[PDB]
Design a protein around this ligand. Sequence first.
Ligand SMILES: *[C@@H]1O[C@H](CO)[C@@H](O)[C@H](O)[C@H]1NC(C)=O
Ligand SMILES: *[C@@H]1O[C@H](CO)[C@@H](O)[C@H](O)[C@H]1NC(C)=O
Lengths: 80, 356
Amino acid sequence: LKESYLEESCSTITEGYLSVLRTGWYTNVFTLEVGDVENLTCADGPSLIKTELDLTKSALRELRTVSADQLAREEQIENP
Amino acid sequence: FVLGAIACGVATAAAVTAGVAIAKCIRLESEVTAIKNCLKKTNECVSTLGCGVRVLATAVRELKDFVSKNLTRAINKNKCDIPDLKMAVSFSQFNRRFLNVVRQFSDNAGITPAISKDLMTDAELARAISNMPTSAGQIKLMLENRAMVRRKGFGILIGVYGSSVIYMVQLPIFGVIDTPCWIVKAAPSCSEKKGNYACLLREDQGWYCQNAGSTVYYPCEKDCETRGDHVFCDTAAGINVAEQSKECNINISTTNYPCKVSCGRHPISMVALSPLGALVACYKGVSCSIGSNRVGIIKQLNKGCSYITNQDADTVTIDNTVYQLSKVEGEQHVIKGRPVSSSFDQFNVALDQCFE
Ligand SMILES: *[C@@H]1O[C@H](CO)[C@@H](O)[C@H](O)[C@H]1NC(C)=O
Ligand SMILES: *[C@@H]1O[C@H](CO)[C@@H](O)[C@H](O)[C@H]1NC(C)=O
């Protein structure tokens, strides 16, 4: 690179860069398949599988409400 | 208006606005089911939505397959304290991506700041880059710069449909590469007499890229980011400028172009960190110094504009703000000249208007 200090204008210009310009957006849609996890239940108390299953059911139910919240926030991104 | 004062944040809002509009289209029942029907017999799909946008569609089925083919038959009779250690460990390994996708979308209210490995693996990142509407030179560059692709992309949550978590990732298409590019920095050049200041400041700071016989100007320098000799630029807040405007970098007074400046009587001390050094505008009211990390403070700087190369000193301080000089090495020129300020409140005007 070459940097030039312009004493007549208290400015610099640095040259020698090669561009990488974002000209567009490519959309990748994902379907993450969790399976019929909400129809499974552990009736025998504390357990490693019970803990993992409750994390999974909990994460599913939380994303549903996160999604709803997003629909109001997307209104504000478009209609402030 | 004043371009540098309005341009930042613009390219970001355009990306979000563009993504949300695509997300709205994907959330329709006809498009969700079309995408779901595309992926019935395969893990990967390409398709054009009703609104015209091309999407690559990817199914991630490890967890669903573990749940269908191992966990369910093993938890017949609704008992989970079974002595199957590999089942519990496999369950924990197979659901961690999902749990990480939920945390990233929950913490960010449905729009992530980047592309995490849980939204997109390296394998999947390479697959999508391969499908981008660009040529081999760009794809080769992008595959060698996946960290930058992740940093400039983002995800948007589509919704939950049954057991199916649907989301979209915007990846940056770097469609134009290796054209000449340069960055302009500036600070207030100000003359002093009778306690009175006569200031000048350039109002065309930022990044410039000569692309396809036409020069483009990116006023918000945060829309561009360097890796070595490469500068990665969002083009959403780009603006064409005439070829002659580069003459402001050798003769601010040229008649071939009305170089944009701001001239006033209110100096603002500041430090403009440049790639190979720093610009330092130091005036009455604040103190400025440069230093090395081994021997303490080098010297106090004189008032006015000083150009400190990143080899003259490792640090520059203005008042109590401390800036780290770059460590890059390069050709450093001082183009000598009488400061135009010493020849003397307008804003973003041609320089010949500052003289009257
Ligand atoms: C699940 O079952 C299938 C066959 O039904 C088997 O190939 C696979 O190894 C099992 N997975 C685990 C993690 O045990
Ligand atoms: C800069 O341009 C002006 C007018 O175009 C001219 O008077 C002046 O001599 C030029 N200076 C240099 C160094 O070219």
